[PDB]
Ligand binder design. Structure first.
Ligand SMILES: Nc1nc2c(ncn2[C@@H]2O[C@H](COP(=O)(O)OP(=O)(O)OP(=O)(O)O)[C@@H](O)[C@H]2O)c(=O)[nH]1
Ligand SMILES: Nc1nc2c(ncn2[C@@H]2O[C@H](COP(=O)(O)OP(=O)(O)O)[C@@H](O)[C@H]2O)c(=O)[nH]1
Ligand SMILES: COc1ccc(CCc2nc3cc(OC)c(OC)c(OC)c3s2)cc1O
Ligand SMILES: [Ca+2]
Ligand SMILES: [Mg+2]
Lengths: 430, 155, 435
């Protein structure tokens, strides 16, 4: 279990994907050209997880960039580490999907999906021990959501024994007041419930709230949002890419984080919260990181964990600090907040320390499988239902070949998902 | 049947085709099978100029389709602020209730159209109106943790 | 008669690495396999030959197989201080581990390598003039340690029916855990191995952890600290196999002395004294003191209270400056003074073995040298408390079928969970019935 094939689809997907490769390249000593300038070796022990060692001690992101809109390929390349990606790995269409999931999933995107698979095959066949896939995509658009989930389903068929992991950006009208996005998200969530083993729910609602209410950014930009994402993405993958006392792979994470196949939507949380540039170098104490990483204001999904129960939690502390302190502080949070963890999953909190920090001195990254995430799904379900009851814009979808019944089936599967979450939130040991 | 053509022209945003059909006797208040009028469609698809023109030609600003949706419902759902205001200025019932008990305030709130929320409130939207499940727009804001909305609704 | 040690998965390999290091130091075998005190060069019949074969070059080779489904832990043996000690072909690695999933270790991934492991074991067996059987080291909580081990034991029973199979099993503790599903792996492997194992020494990671923190003043014990304490205990248990002695001199005698009935085959190991190496000038504890310490629950390899149980067997294995009459006197003052209650059907007696060589300290270890030490092996019904704790964690999750989908997706029938759990319930009853 070593190589992860990363795929980024659509404008959001490519945009946060590029940000991810910047942040982790930097963390691994890699530069915009592939050359390792790291001052510590463990930055390369686990480098093979996200990078193919090419020629010249060159490290190339094992990254496939996909989009039905040719435009984003250029913005990707104009990027800092935009020249680091294999030119053969840019699979781009010509028209785009126009926020229409059905175009991404059934027509335009189905045209391009075979081109993407070929590259996936190439990158997979050159893998010593492929552990699975990581896709970055928005759910609110057409390509990331519609083609992304088609891309997930196709990969799944060909690589059924590999882990499928997504970083899925949930839509929010606070960030994009496009009213078909609930449709796209709901159709996508129906796909993600069945075809992904692990989905990090990255919620634009939460990202906006953090920037606006906490970081006091009055007009948050995608760049501000994506700073939270990339910090989150670096955090949650720390232990895929750094040795540590844990030999973490995507499957051991899944086995310990997913008690029920459909409840694989994780709420990530991060501490400390910072704006771009912000000289917030005040540091933070273990007890502070531990508390904050467990606060609704630090969650990347607009969910109050205190409204549900934590089925499983994995926390990655990063930096110099007494693993004995983190052991004590983490026990502390678990006993003071006992009623927010299910009692029928013993020892459901897992903690790792990792010496290398992200660009701060201390971070905590939280990965919660919390029943409170039903709040996110309920928010989207309600918007979906508002639109769908009036059949607004349904013709955009049915005219691409989608059946109206796919909408009702998505909505039902999402409502079922929320009920499952409530079921385990209310279950007791006795 | 110019009525059927007006409906399509209204949906499609063809201003000139609307003007022509009206001038040839097209039923401004024609209805598709769902009871949608040209004004419903223009309000849904964001055709502000068609909305204004229909309203100067006898459009019933408060027409309801089979599900009780008024044009203001759809404009509030979809988020067309300018159409919302034009509809209100021509007598749209700010508190019209559809077959789900939804008022335009309910739909603007659910969809996060905060400016529309404010406009509806200034125009007398009933923050105590409950949908069929008992939710007022404020309940929706509290249930969904939409603090921005909930601040607007507390004025 | 030869004993083959098999070390399965990370815990079994890391503990095996620690044991064989200690064995080498105890026997005077250098890391390259050379043993100067060994006068016979071809081979020989000495007691340490139960664990070590000899090549024509004078190399003393562990009769040991290391197996893991991923290679990282075994690669450390391959590159460590004892790289030259082992048959390179007796270090076997797959590519992808069992993901903490009993069913992958046992059904899917484990089947890809099981026949190689058996063929490599057969090669060691064929070098044996009188194979007694196997010592199998493994975790309960790991997918390899649990699932591959049970697969392996199943196969060994078929291919080596008359051979004894002893296990050293690492029992999971929250303080040093690797997975939420470890209670499942533990019940699953226990259920399927119960029939195939003659005697199993459970090492409670929590007990070792607590000893490291309390007796060794180690604030956050790592595996290295744990495994050093464990290897000292394992060495004490297997010493009788490796050295001359009169107690437990072969695998069969272990079952005879410690296992009154086939299923309740889980002896409690207690060890004393455990003294920090920082206390190099520690006062030497007497035979009476260390023997008394064997009835302190704090010195137990498994957390349980033997005051709440009945003993069915008790062996005291002394190592060092131990006068037999002082043992007898200490036993007399424990048979009267302590609440030791044997079952009514068992001789209320202690078997005593004395190896007059004091324990060896590993350089870099946490343990002070001591003049005398004692390992007590007892079969006591109080170890049922350890099963009960495990069974309860299992039940909490299985009640909701948490995580079960992972096992069923890896070739396992859901009914195997209930069968395993019922087998455990019967095991618990087996201990109540005996008392
Ligand atoms: N005492 C001790 N326990 C260990 C050691 N390594 C792992 N464990 C314990 O073993 C359990 C995990 O099983 P492992 O042996 O790591 O796993 P494995 O057998 O390699 O199986 P997979 O990795 O799941 O394929 C946990 O209870 C760990 O605490 C070790 O060196 N010493
Ligand atoms: N956080 C974040 N969200 C984005 C970004 N770009 C688009 N989105 C969100 O993605 C949705 C629109 O889909 P998008 O990915 O742009 O279209 P695609 O090309 O079809 O994948 C909306 O919910 C946007 O808020 C971005 O850079 N960052
Ligand atoms: C809930 O209880 C447990 C959870 C998981 C496990 C083992 C597997 C893990 N793999 C990773 C990978 C991680 O990053 C990708 C990561 O955060 C960066 C992790 O958290 C530190 C872990 S934990 C055992 C448990 O007992
Ligand atoms: Ca010899
Ligand atoms: Mg392992």
């Amino acid at each position: 279990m070593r190589e992860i094939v990363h795929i980024q689809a659509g404008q959001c997907g490519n945009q946060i994907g590029a940000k991810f490769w910047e942040v982790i390249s930097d963390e691994h000593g890699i530069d915009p050209t592939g050359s390792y300038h790291g001052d510590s070796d463990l930055q390369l022990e686990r480098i093979n997880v996200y990078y193919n060692e090419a020629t010249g001690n060159k490290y190339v992101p094992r990254a496939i960039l996909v989009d039905l809109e040719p435009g984003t390929m250029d913005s990707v390349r104009s990027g800092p580490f935009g020249q680091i990606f294999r030119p053969d790995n840019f699979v781009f269409g010509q028209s785009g999907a126009g926020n229409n999931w059905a175009k991404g999933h059934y027509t335009e995107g189905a045209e391009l999906v075979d081109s993407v698979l070929d590259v996936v095959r190439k990158e997979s066949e050159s893998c010593d021990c492929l552990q699975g896939f990581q896709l970055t995509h928005s759910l609110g658009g057409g390509t990331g959501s519609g083609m992304g989930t088609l891309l997930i389903s196709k990969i799944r068929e060909e690589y059924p024994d590999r882990i499928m992991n997504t970083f899925s950006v949930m839509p929010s009208p606070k960030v994009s007041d496009t009213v078909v996005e609930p449709y796209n998200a709901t159709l996508s969530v129906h796909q993600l419930v069945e075809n992904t083993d692990e989905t990090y729910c990255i919620d634009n609602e939460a990202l906006y709230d953090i920037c606006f209410r906490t970081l006091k950014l009055t007009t948050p930009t995608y760049g501000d949002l994506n700073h939270l994402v990339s910090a989150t993405m670096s955090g949650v993958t720390t232990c895929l890419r750094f040795p540590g006392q844990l030999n973490a792979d995507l499957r051991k994470l899944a086995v310990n984080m997913v008690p029920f196949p459909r409840l694989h939507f994780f709420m990530p949380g991060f501490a400390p919260l910072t704006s771009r540039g912000s000289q917030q170098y005040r540091a933070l104490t273990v007890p502070e990181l531990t508390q904050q990483m467990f606060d609704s204001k630090n969650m990347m999904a607009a969910c109050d964990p205190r409204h549900g129960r934590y089925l499983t939690v994995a926390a990655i502390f990063r930096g110099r600090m007494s693993m004995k302190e983190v052991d004590e502080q983490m026990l502390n949070v678990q006993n003071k907040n006992s009623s927010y963890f299910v009692e029928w999953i013993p020892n459901n909190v897992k903690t790792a320390v990792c010496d290398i920090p992200p660009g701060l001195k201390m971070s905590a990254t939280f990965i919660g499988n919390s029943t409170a995430i039903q709040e996110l799904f309920k928010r989207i379900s309600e918007q979906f239902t508002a639109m769908f009851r009036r059949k607004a814009f349904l013709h955009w979808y049915t005219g691409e070949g989608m059946d109206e019944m796919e909408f009702t089936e998505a909505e039902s599967n999402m409502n079922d998902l929320v009920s499952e979450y409530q079921q385990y939130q209310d279950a007791t040991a006795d | 049947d110019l009525g059927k053509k007006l409906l399509e022209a209204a949906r499609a945003g063809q201003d000139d085709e609307v003007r022509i059909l009206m001038a040839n006797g097209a039923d401004v208040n024609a209805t598709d099978a769902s009871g949608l009028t040209p004004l419903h469609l223009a309000a849904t698809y964001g055709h502000l100029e068609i909305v204004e023109v229909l309203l100067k030609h006898g459009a019933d600003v408060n027409a309801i389709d089979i599900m009780g949706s008024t044009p203001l419902h759809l404009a509030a759902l979809i988020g067309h602020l300018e159409i919302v205001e034009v509809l209100l200025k021509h007598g749209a019932d700010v508190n019209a209730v559809d077959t789900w008990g939804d008022t335009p305030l309910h739909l603007a709130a659910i969809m996060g159209h905060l400016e529309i929320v404010e406009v509806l409130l200034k125009h007398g939207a009933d923050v105590n109106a409950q949908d069929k499940f008992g939710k007022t727009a404020f309940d929706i804001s509290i249930d969904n943790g939409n603090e921005d909305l909930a601040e607007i609704l507390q004025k | 008669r030869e004993c083959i040690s098999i070390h399965v998965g990370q815990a079994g390999v890391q503990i095996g690495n620690a044991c064989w290091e200690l064995y080498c130091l105890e026997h005077g075998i250098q890391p390259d396999g050379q043993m100067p005190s060994d006068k016979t060069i071809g081979g020989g019949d000495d007691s340490f030959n139960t664990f070590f074969s000899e090549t024509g070059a004078g190399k003393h080779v562990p009769r040991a197989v290391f197996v893991d489904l991923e290679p990282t832990v075994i690669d450390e043996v391959r590159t460590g201080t004892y790289r030259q000690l082992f048959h390179p072909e007796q270090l076997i690695t797959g590519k992808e581990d069992a993901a903490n999933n009993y069913a992958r270790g046992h059904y899917t991934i484990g089947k890809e390598i099981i026949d190689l492991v058996l063929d490599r074991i057969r090669k060691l067996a064929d070098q044996c003039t009188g194979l007694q059987g196997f010592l199998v080291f493994h975790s309960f909580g790991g997918g390899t340690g649990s699932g591959f081990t049970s697969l392996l034991m199943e196969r060994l029973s078929v291919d080596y029916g008359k051979k004894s199979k002893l296990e050293f099993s690492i029992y999971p503790a929250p303080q040093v855990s690797t997975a939420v599903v470890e209670p499942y792996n533990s019940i699953l492997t226990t259920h399927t191995t119960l029939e195939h194992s003659d005697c199993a020494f459970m090492v409670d990671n929590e007990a070792i952890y607590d000893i490291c923190r309390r007796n060794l003043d180690i604030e956050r014990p790592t595996y290295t600290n744990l495994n050093r304490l464990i290897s000292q205990i394992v060495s004490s248990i297997t010493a009788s196999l490796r050295f001359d002695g009169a107690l437990n001199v072969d695998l069969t005698e272990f079952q005879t002395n410690l296992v009154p009935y086939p299923r309740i085959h889980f002896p409690l190991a207690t060890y004393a004294p455990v003294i920090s190496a920082e206390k190099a000038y520690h006062e030497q504890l007497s035979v009476a003191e260390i023997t008394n310490a064997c009835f302190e629950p704090a010195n137990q390899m498994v957390k349980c209270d033997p005051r709440h149980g009945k003993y069915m067997a008790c062996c005291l294995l002394y190592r060092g400056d131990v006068v037999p009459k002082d043992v007898n006197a200490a036993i007399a003052t424990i048979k009267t003074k302590r609440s030791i209650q044997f079952v009514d059907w068992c001789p209320t007696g202690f078997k005593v073995g004395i190896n007059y060589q004091p324990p060896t300290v590993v350089p870099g270890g946490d343990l002070a040298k001591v003049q005398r030490a004692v390992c007590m092996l007892s079969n006591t019904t109080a170890i049922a408390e350890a099963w009960a704790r495990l069974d309860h964690k299992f039940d909490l999750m299985y009640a909701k079928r948490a995580f079960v989908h992972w096992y069923v997706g890896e070739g396992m029938e859901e009914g195997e969970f209930s069968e395993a759990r019922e087998d455990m319930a019967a095991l618990e009853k087996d201990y109540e019935e005996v008392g």
